[PDB]
Design a protein around this nucleic acid. Structure first.
Ligand SMILES: [Mg+2]
Ligand SMILES: [Mg+2]
Ligand SMILES: [Mg+2]
Ligand SMILES: [Mg+2]
Ligand SMILES: [Mg+2]
Ligand SMILES: [Mg+2]
Ligand SMILES: [Mg+2]
Ligand SMILES: [Mg+2]
Ligand SMILES: [Mg+2]
Ligand SMILES: [Mg+2]
Ligand SMILES: [Mg+2]
Ligand SMILES: [Mg+2]
Ligand SMILES: [Mg+2]
Ligand SMILES: [Mg+2]
Ligand SMILES: [Mg+2]
Ligand SMILES: [Mg+2]
Ligand SMILES: [Mg+2]
Ligand SMILES: [Mg+2]
Ligand SMILES: [Mg+2]
Ligand SMILES: [Mg+2]
Ligand SMILES: [Mg+2]
Ligand SMILES: [Mg+2]
Ligand SMILES: [Zn+2]
Lengths: 174, 141, 38, 59, 206
RNA sequence: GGGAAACAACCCAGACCGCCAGCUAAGGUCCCAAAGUUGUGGUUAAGUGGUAAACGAUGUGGGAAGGCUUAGACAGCUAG
RNA sequence: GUCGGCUCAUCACAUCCUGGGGCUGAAGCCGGUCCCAAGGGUAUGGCUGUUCGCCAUUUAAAGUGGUACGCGAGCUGGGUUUAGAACGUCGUGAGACAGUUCGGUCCCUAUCUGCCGUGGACGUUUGAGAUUUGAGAGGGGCUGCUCCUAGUACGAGAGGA
RNA sequence: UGAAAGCAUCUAAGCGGGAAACUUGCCUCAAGAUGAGAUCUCACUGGGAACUUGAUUCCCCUGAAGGGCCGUCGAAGACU
């Protein structure tokens, strides 16, 4: 496991309250808790964390890599924040955010009002550009997925909510 | 010549078993064998010489493998197409005592004596039971 | 999705994946290459 | 019926039926199961002495 | 929470537009709370009411003591209503004012009893040929099963038997008029039972 | 007779009678239901066990080889 | 006790409609194919004994099967196998045809199981008059068209969400 | 989200969305649910003897709450 053998470098300003398996990490943006799997060696020696497997079965070998990946996502989270860019394509497709409610205009006969959960903030620098911000990578990806779920991109004009780096497959009528 | 247990002079004890963390079938065999009196030298096949078993923490019984979602309890209502099925997991959430009760009932004889032995099994959902006046002795298998 | 007894990679971008005990082929290039249950 | 009662009586003494019968052959005890089942119910001290004699013979 | 009334018959209401509303008139004499059932005592929340009158000779001593505990007069019957977070004390008068005109109600009653009914009337079975050679089997059920497989009649088979005289609930009836001065409730349409039959009016489930 | 749930023709075994004696056969020994919740070392995760083929698949265990490789192997990233 | 019809069904899913989806040689409208799904629903006539089929006109659809090719101690008796008669054909003939045709007796008061209703007895641990919880069970669950959204999205237009 | 497999991956750990199918929600039946449940209220507060001494039997006094019979009936009903 090249991932579990790669230690996660703790930056400046991250505290830990490692108690048994309930790891916790704080930062300038928030605090997150992780219940580490009871088969993964997690310990702290310096401003750095490394992960090992208590028993080399196979599930624990994968568990160590996934725990290392999760903790790194935690460390990057509380220190920098995670973001997902969403673009809106199509005439009359507008998105506007008012606090904890995102209002989408996606060619429907009703108003699309999405309630962002706690810890997630959405900004719309343009009427056709969404910006989900948060400290938990899973929640940021989850929220961005449901917003794109309202109108996924179509292959004939690209219209619909899409990720900024998403390669929207395109085609045309023969 | 061979001894037989008279129903009038059967000594019956009360035991409480904690089902928390126990495998359903392996706990049900001990319960079924102690409801039969097979642990007693006075065992008679036509006499209920067994003890009373109180089971607590019934929802905390466990099944190995993928049996939590895969073990299915079927019954028929007598009406055409009346076959009904429930999960182990959803039966535990709905009628947790029925899970232990079903596993013991299939392990008892299917006759009047087996229904008599079933009447000595008391299964409860909480960590407490109403039979404190009988002072059950804890029986950890 | 194409559901057949014999699923296999139809191109380089096709990937063999097991999900919940089902052998699946997903393709990042062609949605037409999606297969199931091999 | 005798074997079941001997099993119940011997398990109260730390032995299964199969281990007790093997022990009762290692130590040459020819008490049959009808009498053994009568001891296990009516003469429990006598039955305990026999079980201990089988346990010693096994090991 | 509902009320216990008597079906007083059917009439019509003419609106100023000229529309005729068929109404069932329900006389809801004020209902007396006989006993309030709480969770900590009975396992569930309910209110027990009585309505009407009963001559003292037809009231048993046990029922008379039950009524005297609530300090209410004996009624022709006693009914219960499952409750939410409502609070009632014995002796309260649940009158027809808990309803307002225009609101949906469910009316429950005992439907008219038709006695032993044939399959044509009870289950809408089709008649067989009245002519063309049919022997003595014009209204009879026909086949009641298949054959050797399954060699029996299935439970719940539609057969002839008793029809009516059972508890029926008609749902989503509009209140046309609430006449609190005469303890009258006018609901649009028909309600189960005959005139003089006990009906229960409750707010609509749907 | 015993086993194979039930089951002429399969398996063990050929019933003169009685016994509230013992040993075995086939088959078995968690409960129904007599007897190991026996011991040691592995495999399976599919309730496979406890029904089936051509064919398909980074399921997983073992073994014998081979190619590249700290003169930088494979994968990823940058650039041509 | 046979084919078909009538009455009444019950189950399967290899689904006809309705529901959810993937791919499309899927612009839209409409389709094609496959996966999931059995809750409910799923023609009326003309001809023919017909099942079928063809035709007419509907429908969201007019599903495929099992159930003694479900169902005659429930009905029918058109077909099919009695005895009459006839045609064609075969046989010298008596007759015969799996060819045609006109006519031609369909019994049973339900004991048990079962089912639909409706009581009596006892039990529920003193008895009684009321009210009740709900383990459980059964019933129900179909769908069209029009309008707004909007002649908007889509489209060269046509058409058209 | 995410490793095993530095990438990828809905899955292995973890977190979702999701159908007239299933469990409810609607309606009716329902404690013979022998596991026979719950609540309110009502009624009955005497002696003697005996045997095979106690959840026994017999004699006298007592006969409640209530139920039924009977009658007048019913938009209830084959009889009930
Ligand atoms: Mg048996
Ligand atoms: Mg899934
Ligand atoms: Mg009537
Ligand atoms: Mg007709
Ligand atoms: Mg006739
Ligand atoms: Mg006739
Ligand atoms: Mg007639
Ligand atoms: Mg049968
Ligand atoms: Mg044999
Ligand atoms: Mg046998
Ligand atoms: Mg045994
Ligand atoms: Mg072992
Ligand atoms: Mg199997
Ligand atoms: Mg390289
Ligand atoms: Mg299917
Ligand atoms: Mg159907
Ligand atoms: Mg449903
Ligand atoms: Mg036709
Ligand atoms: Mg005509
Ligand atoms: Mg048939
Ligand atoms: Mg028949
Ligand atoms: Mg007839
Ligand atoms: Zn491909």
């Amino acid at each position: 496991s090249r991932v579990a053998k790669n230690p996660v470098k703790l930056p400046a300003g991250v505290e830990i309250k490692l108690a048994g398996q309930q790891l916790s990490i704080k930062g300038a943006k928030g605090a997150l808790e992780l219940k580490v799997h009871p088969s993964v060696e997690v310990i702290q020696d310096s401003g750095e964390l490394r992960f090992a497997a208590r028993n080399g079965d196979q599930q624990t070998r994968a568990m160590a890599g996934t725990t290392r990946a999760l903790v790194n996502n935690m460390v990057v989270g509380v220190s920098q924040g995670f973001e997902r860019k969403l673009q809106l394509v199509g005439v009359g497709y507008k998105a506007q955010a008012k606090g904890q409610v995102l209002s989408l205009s996606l060619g429907f006969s009703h108003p699309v009002d999405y309630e962002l959960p706690a810890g997630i903030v959405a900004e719309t620098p343009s009427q056709t550009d969404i910006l989900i911000k948060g400290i938990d990578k899973q929640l940021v990806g989850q929220v961005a997925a449901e917003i794109r779920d309202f109108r996924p991109p179509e292959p004939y004009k690209g219209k619909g909510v899409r990720y900024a780096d998403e390669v929207v497959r395109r085609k045309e009528a023969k | 010549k061979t001894y037989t247990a008279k129903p009038e002079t059967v000594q019956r004890d009360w035991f409480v078993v904690d089902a928390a963390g126990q495998t359903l079938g392996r706990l049900a065999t001990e319960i079924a064998r102690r409801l039969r009196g097979k642990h007693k030298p006075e065992y008679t096949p036509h006499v209920d010489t067994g003890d009373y078993i109180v089971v607590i923490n019934a929802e905390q019984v466990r099944v190995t493998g993928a049996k939590t979602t895969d073990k299915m309890y079927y019954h028929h209502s007598g009406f055409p197409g009346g076959i009904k099925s429930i999960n182990f997991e959803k039966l535990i959430a709905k009628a947790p005592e029925r899970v232990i009760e079903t596993a013991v009932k299939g392990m008892l004889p299917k006759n009047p004596l087996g229904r008599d032995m079933y009447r000595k099994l008391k299964v409860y959902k909480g960590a407490s039971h109403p039979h404190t006046a009988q002072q059950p002795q804890e029986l950890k298998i | 999705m194409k559901v057949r007894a014999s699923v296999k990679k139809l191109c380089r971008n096709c990937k063999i994946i097991r999900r919940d005990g089902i052998v699946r082929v997903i393709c990042s290039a062609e949605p037409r290459h999606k297969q199931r249950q091999g | 019926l005798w074997i079941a009662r001997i099993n119940a009586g011997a398990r109260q003494n730390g032995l299964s039926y199969s281990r007790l019968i093997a022990g009762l052959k290692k130590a040459a005890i020819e008490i049959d199961r009808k009498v053994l089942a009568d001891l296990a119910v009516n003469e429990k001290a006598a039955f305990t002495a026999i079980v201990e004699k089988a346990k010693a013979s096994l090991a | 929470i509902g009320v216990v009334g008597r079906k007083c018959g059917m009439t019509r209401i003419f609106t100023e537009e000229g529309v005729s509303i068929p109404v069932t008139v329900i006389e809801v004499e004020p209902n007396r709370v006989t006993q309030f059932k709480t969770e900590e005592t009975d396992g569930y929340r309910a209110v027990q009411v009585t309505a009407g009158e009963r001559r003292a000779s037809r009231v048993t001593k046990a029922q008379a003591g039950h009524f005297a505990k609530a300090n209410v007069a004996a009624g022709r019957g006693v009914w219960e209503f499952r409750l939410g977070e409502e609070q009632y004390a014995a002796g309260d008068q649940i009158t027809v004012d808990l309803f307002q005109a225009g609101q949906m109600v469910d009316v429950t009653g005992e439907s008219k009893g038709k006695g032993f009914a044939g399959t044509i009337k009870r289950w809408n079975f089709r008649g067989q040929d009245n002519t063309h050679g049919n022997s003595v089997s014009h209204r009879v059920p026909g086949s009641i099963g298949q054959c050797q497989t399954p060699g029996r009649v299935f439970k719940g088979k539609k057969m002839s038997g008793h029809l009516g005289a059972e508890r029926v609930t008609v749902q989503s009836l509009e209140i046309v008029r609430v006449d609190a001065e005469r303890n009258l409730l006018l609901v649009k349409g028909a309600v189960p039972g005959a005139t003089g039959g006990d009906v229960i009016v409750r707010p609509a489930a749907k």
